[PDB]
């Protein structure tokens, strides 16, 4: 049959394949090429000191056990092929609770080219820690990070790198800005080495620079405070003998100020 040719290609690829071992376990390091397409920078929760981000998480690595010779150079396969091969165990260091979307079918991608180069895209919604120093609140700016790296494989086993230039390896979509309080100024990346109890690991960093707006606070706090002070400023213009009127000016301004 016409479809038996690709079936036996996949069955020949998975024959004798150990998915528990990374490519070149005892011979080299598995370089993983990573880039991120942010489809929406979600709302920043100031109470939890966190932010939400939806991203296309793309990783690419060379595997030599997945070489084939056939009529099609790229095998655009589904998600069931992804669990049958080795994939890197990338996790977010400062993530709190993230969901990999699986509606309707697991939101994953797998493309095996003929030289063995892979590509593995995912949809995630990362709730990551953004520690905030609110000394200049509400006129503050933050650099909320997004740190990801391998969980089990050390620096001598799996290293991470950006597939494009580092200035162009985190792309934020134009319509994708769900920020209502802040506004996104730009991105900032950097690789690095983190020392842990187990060993040294390669952690890739993505700093999102934010800047809050006083819009909500120059109408809820600052302006009702100015109007409260000004309404106590008109009590000097009343009569001296009007004791209860200037008294109710004083007590109502003190109550409005303390309830604000």
């Amino acid at each position: 049959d016409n479809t038996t040719v690709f079936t036996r290609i996949l069955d020949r690829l998975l024959d004798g394949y150990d998915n528990r071992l990374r490519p070149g376990l005892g011979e080299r390091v598995t370089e993983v090429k990573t880039d991120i397409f942010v489809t929406s920078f979600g709302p920043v929760s100031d109470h939890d000191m966190e932010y939400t981000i939806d991203v296309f998480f793309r990783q690419s690595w060379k595997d030599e056990r997945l070489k084939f010779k056939g009529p099609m150079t790229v095998l655009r396969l589904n998600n069931l092929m992804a669990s049958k091969i080795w994939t890197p165990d990338t996790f977010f260091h400062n993530g709190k609770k993230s969901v990999a979307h699986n509606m309707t079918m697991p939101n994953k991608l797998l493309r095996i080219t003929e030289d063995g180069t892979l590509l593995y895209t995912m949809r995630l919604t990362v709730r990551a820690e953004c520690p905030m120093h609110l000394e200049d609140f509400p006129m503050d700016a933050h650099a909320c990070p997004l740190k990801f790296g391998s969980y089990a494989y050390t620096r001598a086993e799996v290293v991470y790198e950006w597939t494009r230039e580092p200035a162009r390896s985190v792309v934020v979509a134009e319509d994708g800005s769900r920020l209502n309080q802040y506004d996104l100024l730009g991105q900032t990346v950097d690789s690095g080495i983190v020392q842990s109890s187990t060993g040294e690991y390669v952690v890739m960093t993505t700093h999102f620079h934010l800047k809050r707006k006083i819009g909500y606070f120059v109408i809820q706090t600052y302006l009702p405070c100015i109007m409260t002070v000004i309404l106590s400023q008109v009590s000097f213009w009343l009569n001296r003998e009007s004791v209860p009127a200037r008294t109710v000016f004083g007590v109502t301004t003190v109550l409005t100020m303390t309830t604000l």
Partner: antibody
Amino acid sequence: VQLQQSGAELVKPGASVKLSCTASGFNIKDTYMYWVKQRPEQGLEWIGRIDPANGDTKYDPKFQGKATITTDTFSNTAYLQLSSLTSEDTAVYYCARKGLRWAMDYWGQGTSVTVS
Amino acid sequence: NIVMTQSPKSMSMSVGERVTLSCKASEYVGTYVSWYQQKPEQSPKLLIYGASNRYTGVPDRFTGSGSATDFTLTIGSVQAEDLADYHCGQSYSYPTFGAGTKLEL
């Protein structure tokens, strides 16, 4: 592991020159190939970028049009085209492999071009 | 573009003491600089990648360092065979290079 380039060239100004370097010991489809200009007693100047697996090329804005980068798969070779050669184009050219952490790992021996 | 402003042009000291270099970036490059050596009549060779990562074959005397904007390369007890020109480059964006720091006796 070795990047062997072409020889030295000497043509009249206003002409065109073919310049090439052959990579051995690996394949150029994995890493980017970077071209750089070294004027004598001056600093290095980056020419452009090529990704041979995708075929995409990115160039410096001051080198757009006068220079372009091509490649092929079977010979595992990166090429330059230079057009409208002038006196300030007299320099030595290296092709540099993209390395670990974007570092320009390997370098060629160098081809010196000269006009008269 | 990103502008590399490594200084000075050349330094002229003897053999066996500490000499440091400096590379200053116009815009942010985060730990993606690289340092090369340039002997007369010789192709460049890599020394440091990242910010301070020592390449294979580099002696231990060559110590680099870096930050978000300021970068440096410290030499401990420079010898006679190290008399060459040094280059600072970046690759956080499309790659650029500095002018060049030389060494003299």
